Symmetry: D2
Subunit: 485 residues, 4 copies
């Protein structure tokens, strides 16, 4: 597998001719992303990202493409890869290679290695490409990460270099894990210091999602986190809006494109009642479904009950569920035994960041027979029961794999948060240690205020007197630091 090179830009993507359709959709999205568009304006002269060489690992969609070009508009060079084998929107990847003023013959964009429907092998080669900058003396100096695959490939790659060996894999490590070690192994026979030099070049990572953030926290606790990290997931305008309201949008979109099943009247089981399970549950309720929820956290569970949902175990409920969704960020939610419990033609999906929430390995080793219905939609049949289950996206985040992930207006929040964090970490890199940070609240309020005004909400201004009363500035921050919204 070798990159394609066209006008001095290396890339690997499905179809460059898709760039014109891409570009139309990016222009509509610009109008739905006032967060990115307002940062392109405010920061257009300052070029705060000059010198940045951002390796981005993030679903290669239309919304991402507007983030990329926000980042280039602000002075950075970028190289991109998807953080998921089914997340890439192919017209969008074409539109990024091509750039606003390029064509397929004369592209004027950025390196992108991503298409919809990678193999695990293809997936990890692209991430490597995304991370390996052309000039050996100018490696990546910034990571923009979603789920921490880029971060993991750098930190563990350096780890196994410093140790002088990449270890082999156990016959039953995840496939995903075998592939990853294999790439690391192969490159170690040829280049014995690649990741070490990258890890040393990288000045910061910015991390977009819960799963990724947890992995950061587990690196920093191991003493093994080699550069500053901003936790972008836990900006208020990210977690409470993307994880929740985005999912309220894109969960039923994904189930729609994949199955066209009526949601109304059906029994629905939502595993997890974090931000994501919250949107899931509220999306499904809005559509007339009968929803129960699973949880391990008593606080989130009591929220569910108060919100009208039975709190049940997978054990007691799975046999009656017409549609099952995992939304935990944990492993081993729906096992093979749970899948064999499900009613004929029930639907099973994962909206959590990785495929191990459902036991897809054990379903693949089970002896069930698989009939592909269409892309990312599989009928599985169990000989002993004669029942068949519809599985979405091979147990990968179904909203990005069966549809288009969250909408632009929502990613504007997330990506505005990300753009700020890239700017912050790059311009003020010396004011951070190798720990995990969150953005100051006044920046989150900046991010929300943009979207209120765009939507046409009218915020009230505190009087002199009211601000002293609440003990705040008329211009914020307006809430204590531990405030929960």
């Amino acid at each position: 597998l070798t990159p394609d090179v066209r006008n001095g830009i290396d890339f690997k993507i499905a179809d460059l001719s898709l760039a014109d359709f891409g570009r139309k959709e990016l222009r509509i999205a610009e109008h739905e992303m006032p967060g990115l568009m307002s940062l392109r304006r405010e920061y257009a002269e300052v070029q705060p990202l000059k010198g940045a060489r951002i390796s981005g690992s993030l679903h290669m969609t239309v919304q991402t493409a507007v983030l990329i070009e926000t980042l280039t508009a602000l002075g950075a060079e970028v190289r991109w890869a998807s953080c998921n084998i089914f997340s890439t929107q192919d017209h969008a990847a074409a539109a990024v290679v091509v750039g606003p003023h390029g064509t397929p013959d004369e592209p004027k964009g950025v390196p992108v290695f991503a298409w919809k429907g990678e193999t695990l092998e293809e997936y990890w080669w692209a991430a490597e490409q995304m991370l390996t900058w052309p000039d050996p003396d100018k490696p990546a100096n910034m990571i923009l990460d979603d789920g921490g695959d880029a971060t993991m490939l750098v930190l563990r790659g350096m780890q196994y270099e410093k140790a002088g060996v990449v270890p082999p894999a156990e016959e039953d490590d995840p496939a995903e894990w075998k592939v990853f070690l294999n790439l690391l192994r192969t490159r170690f026979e040829t280049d014995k210091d690649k990741w070490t030099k990258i890890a040393e070049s990288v000045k910061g990572v910015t991390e977009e999602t819960t799963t990724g953030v947890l992995r950061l926290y587990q690196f920093a606790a191991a003493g093994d986190l080699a550069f500053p990290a901003i936790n972008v997931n836990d900006s208020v305008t990210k977690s409470k809006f993307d994880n929740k309201y985005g999912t309220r949008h894109s969960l039923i979109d994904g189930i729609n494109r994949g199955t066209d099943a009526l949601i109304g009247g059906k029994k629905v089981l939502i595993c997890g009642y974090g931000d994501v399970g919250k949107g899931c549950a509220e999306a499904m309720k809005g559509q007339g479904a009968r929803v129960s929820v699973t949880e391990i956290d008593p606080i989130n569970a009591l929220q569910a009950m108060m919100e009208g949902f039975d709190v049940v175990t997978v054990e007691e409920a799975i046999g009656d569920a017409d549609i099952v969704v995992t939304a935990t960020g944990n492993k081993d939610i729906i096992m093979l035994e749970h899948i064999k419990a499900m009613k004929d033609h029930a639907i099973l999906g994962n909206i959590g960041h990785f495929d191990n929430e459902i036991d897809m390995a054990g379903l693949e080793r089970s002896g069930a027979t698989r009939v592909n219905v269409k892309p990312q939609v599989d009928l599985w049949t169990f000989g002993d029961t004669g029942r068949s289950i519809i599985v979405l996206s091979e147990g990968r985040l179904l909203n990005l794999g069966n549809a288009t992930g969250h909408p632009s207006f929502v990613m504007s929040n997330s990506f505005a948060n990300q753009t700020i964090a890239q700017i912050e970490l790059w311009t003020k890199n010396d004011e951070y240690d190798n720990e995990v940070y969150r953005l100051p609240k006044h920046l989150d309020e900046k991010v929300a205020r943009i979207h209120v005004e765009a939507l046409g909400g009218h915020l009230t201004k505190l009087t002199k007197e009211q601000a002293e009363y609440l003990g705040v500035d008329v211009e914020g921050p307006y809430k204590p630091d531990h405030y929960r919204y």
Copy 2:
């Protein structure tokens, strides 16, 4: 254009190689259609529609497909066309032509004349092929109608034969009227008794939608109805389930796939607040939208206000709406003047039965320019203001044109009523006059029951004494004839 013929089946569809993707989706819809399936079991042996030659004008979807193979399992012969230029699912057409145990080379299915993306001429061409059976000793004896196009063809085309002349079209009649007349005048040069003979052959029409039904009420008021009609729309289990809950599902699917625009937080205007617009509003509200409603009927309008919606006019509302949807079954709802007042990149669509709810004709002759984004998605730009509008399906039903229309389970309600009404008019024909009828209430409760059962709902049975107290039989009907549910 010329029909294809494989194995003694005339037809004209996009692509026969789509048979297999069709058949897979058909077997999945059958599990979601217990109403059709129950009717297949109940009536297999009775072959109640033997000798019926059914001509069908109804959106050629996966769901319509399971209806067709229900009429054939019941003993009918059918010929099919879609009743819309954008609603055909091409894989479902392919499968209906091929049949359950046909192949694309040796089809063993039914004539179909429909593909997604027909021009107006090929629509009426298609429509005529469907009503024209081979062997003039055996024309169509049953119409299955949605919209009234098949019935309008047969009944105007008769009345133009009796007047000895097809009329000219005036300077500015709908293109669709001009193409419609074009088809009849051309036919009248070669065949002056064709529609008279076909109308004389038709034992009954069954009509599926409010628009259709109203046109039936108009033929019968003028004294032109040539055969009995069943109004299928007005079954309680069609109107209150399909029109309302189907739309609640299919409206947002249509908008999602066309635009991917966030719904949450947007101002939304639904025009009309009957069953269709009740569904729209419900669906929009459940996604976190700020909904307003227009109406002419104060009863329907008081209902909206009681549901949390502002009742407003287009005029007060139009310039602020982020999304505007017409659900009225009437014409002239969003006029060019309204379109010009819309905000930059607002989304406009029609979910009623035809394209004149929005002023498309006015749009096209206005001097705004069009840029196609993708199929059934158009950006129109007003150079004077600089503001663009995204139009959906060229103003035609957006859920069928931009997505897939209602889900199988819902259609199972409307298609069971279809099948039952075909059976009643075929088997008890002598029992009807040239009038519009509605099905007994016991049959409506029969269709509701199949679906309660299928969803796991448990009906409570009346005691003898309870049933006496209510003055109903333990088995129903349970409500007086004027009951509104």
Copy 3:
């Protein structure tokens, strides 16, 4: 018992010092009842009800009071009684007796026999008083009824006078019914033609409720309906607004005041999914409850499931329900045996029309022990299991019994329909048979329209061309007769 008398008016009402509080709440009511206000004005000069002598049998509330001063503003003579033992608001009883301009010592009002907390004996007495006009030779000529208690009395009163024998109550008959016959038999010592001569005098009845309406369909089915009747319940502005939305408001109010129990997070069982049951589910859902539903009718049951509720039997869900509400208008819903299976401190109430939805008689006779908490709130304990149930209003309609029933604005619909139908039967006698009737659509639309306007809803006007397209008048009704809204 003996009537009071001041300034010409016989009454019997809790306490007269309460005209002040009453009058206040009554002028607040007036502002929330434009349907009544509009009617007071329109027919002000005209006095449509001149000579009419009206015997109202309907919950003596602050809304009934504004309906009464409407009927007198239109030129009628009224005699009032509550149609329920707990539903009277004693400050409104007081204000009607006293009048808009009077004193407790100098009452310018009208005759009212009712107070909160009647005995079956006092109730039926006060009913007899109400339907007992003082003068000749000029008795009751109009019954305004609710539940049909007035009409039963009169019609069976006559029925027994004709047969000679007032029959002796059987032992398994309710106490309500034993009292009823007692009352008749006593009057059938002294008077010998009381009820015959009242039945002859009565020109017609207007019946407010579903249960009353069924009793009228049963009477007319016998051939023993003695005069014309209007089914007021079955007006759209009545049934689809009062039964549904007023219950949505007044169910949770009854429960709050009775018990103050957290609704959010509780499992709740609604028996019945008609208009009432629909309003209960909605209210309970909106507060966060986990709602299930029971039904006999598969159409109503498919609606509940489509609206996100399990459809279940009492049997399967009784044992888990924190709150159980009957909304059926039938008998024998929650039997003693179901009460015994209930969880400790579960709440139980009836919102239908009488107290035999819940098997109260079976409870009283069973050996549970009643502890009164306060008026209309009883704790019942089963000593064998040790579990207690909170019973509301002794199983009488809990919303009028534990609170204030439906709000003014809602009642403004039902009562507008009541006044209009009192005008129609009074002014237009000769045009009605001894059959049950419903008001015409434009009168339904008229009521809805006043209310839409009052809430600030702006209806659209059909253009002349729109109206010919839909086959309706710009003004006249918009829907066919069988339209279900």
Copy 4:
């Protein structure tokens, strides 16, 4: 005003004869307060609060009553006053002076100073009495506060005692404050070190609400806090359940008891969108209102618009509001000009904590004329407009003033938190500096888990693999410290 004394217990309350009624409601509340009952078991053997003498300043409700008796099952001595002049539930205060085994002639309860409908002099007399313990060797050694009126009385009284003067108050000042200074000055004459000696034995304060916590932060910022305090408002189980789901219950209760107004279809303005405003809006939306919101915080304003609500200013929306509710915790939300702008018979209320959210000062000084309707309901007429406005509770927390405040199940949470906070600041007094503290997450989770259990929800148990996967103990806590739910 002097304290009554029966059987050695000083108190001042409405009617001691209300004890029987109270005690019934208390024992029902115990079945709905598993949090409080679970601690009574866990700890009445331990006796953790032995020697605590708790001066509590907390609405004197049935719910607060079950808390008082929790604290006394755990060893505490208590003295109580209500923190609001209308928030007293007279019967519950009677029930608490009486005790579980007492009668009105032989009370066995605790001292209580509260009655619904105190004056301002009376209000602060009671607080004096609640803080003033009989033994002066043994003064109050703990405080349970709700709005910091007790904490301000003890620290603001002590600043004036170190200062050798109570300053005077000007004609322009808040009315409650002159009163507040009249008390500290009157006492200062006869007693010079009262609050100094009190400020010095108090081992710690537990603060229950937002406003009380702002004022606490205002004290500890100036180095003026003399003891270790606990912010109990900002326990997840309090803020996210009480303020939100508690208010969703008690807002509409209050408005219903005060007005009987249809909420459905009315334009409602909610001022603020924290927890309180959140619950307000959800409750009003559930009831079919058309809700708009006002905010000064861009994040909460965005959350609002994502939930379906316009985000408006008071100035732009107030002429149209049918019902106005303030929920900010801020002064000067609705001024006299705004109240003068309201339509006639619109309703206005505060649900914040103090009464200055509405400009009740200006309104009483406006020259507007007041009719009282019933307790806590006033009609204010403006002679210039002829417009009257219904104000609830004279602008004081309308949930507690017009009804009964939050339900027991909900208060069960806020109070298991206070209970635990009390136990901690008392048993483990050494660990806390003189700063504002929050409970650890493992205790919040404890509270939530008792209630999940009580409701019948089944929590899932992490396996060991998963707990490792997530980096948590199987036993919790499950979330990062900054996690917002």
